[PDB]
């Protein structure tokens, strides 16, 4: 049974800062990894999709809807980076994976402005 580890646990982000979020996919089960986001703009927990990286070759898929960038660091480590932090990408992130048609989720990472 696969478990995903997001890093870090939280991010209190400065305006304009670049944030890498990384998610290690353990076990050894599935294809790529899907990155998901919950805009702080929504009062009701509405997950929006962000990107999917294939496990096999470097081959991402971004939904149509500058800000993000993603790569597969060596092995099992899927990086999602927000290029410039702002109110737009301010919210909660997590990766997801699909083995034997079962969805798995990492913890959620609150990336929220400065304090």
């Amino acid at each position, epitope marked *: 049974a696969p478990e995903l580890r997001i890093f870090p646990k939280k*991010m*209190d982000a400065e305006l304009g800062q670049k944030v890498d979020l*990384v998610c290690e996919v353990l076990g050894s089960v599935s294809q790529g990894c899907s990155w998901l986001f919950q805009n702080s703009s929504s009062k009701l927990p509405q997950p929006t999709f962000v990107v999917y990286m294939a496990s096999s070759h470097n081959k991402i898929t971004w939904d149509e809807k500058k800000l993000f960038s993603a790569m597969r660091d060596t*092995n099992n480590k899927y990086v999602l980076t927000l290029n410039k932090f702002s109110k737009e990408n301010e919210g909660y992130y997590f990766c997801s994976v699909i083995s034997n048609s079962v969805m798995y989720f990492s913890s959620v990472v609150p990336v929220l402005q400065k304090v």
Partner: antibody
Amino acid sequence: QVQLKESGPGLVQPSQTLSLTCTVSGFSLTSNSVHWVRQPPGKGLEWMGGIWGDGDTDYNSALKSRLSISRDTSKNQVFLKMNSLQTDDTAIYFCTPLIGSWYFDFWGPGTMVTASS
Amino acid sequence: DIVMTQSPSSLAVSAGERVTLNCKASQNVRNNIAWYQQKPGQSPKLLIYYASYRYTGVPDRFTGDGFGTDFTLAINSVQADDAAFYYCQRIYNSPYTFGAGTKLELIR
């Protein structure tokens, strides 16, 4: 690519403050954390504390009151200040980061710091 | 607390034997454990992460077992190079406490 080197005066007069620098390469301080582990001669390893991507610091209760970790992100440097050194503080000090993971897979080589007059 | 207890204090074993080191956490921490190997005068070297995963480069014979409170580093046919200290660490939550280590001595 990933590398850390600990530097600082290798002899501290007792009651003075230890100051070490850890210069880093191969990753950003902005998204990862750097931690200090120390190891007295013949004794085991000891997590001391660390500093996170966003500047948050985290110490271990044993040393909370006399420990101070900061960083200069513009020069890839993380510092360690420790107060009123004694005999029991003589050790090797390692900096070792968490990059994208929650385990310590990369380590600096370590510096000896004797507390003696 | 979360106290980390490693037993035994030290072992004498022979080139080619299986060995088992134990690690006990006063609290439940699922699989949030790391194992390291250290030769005196050297930095620790990560062997095993999240209780059971072997780090890239680490040889076949190093294996890790356990979840909750009791954890096990095992070496299947030990070799002379394995004479070292072995430490477990709690991993995900602060403090990331170290066991007092186990010493692995060899018989020839």
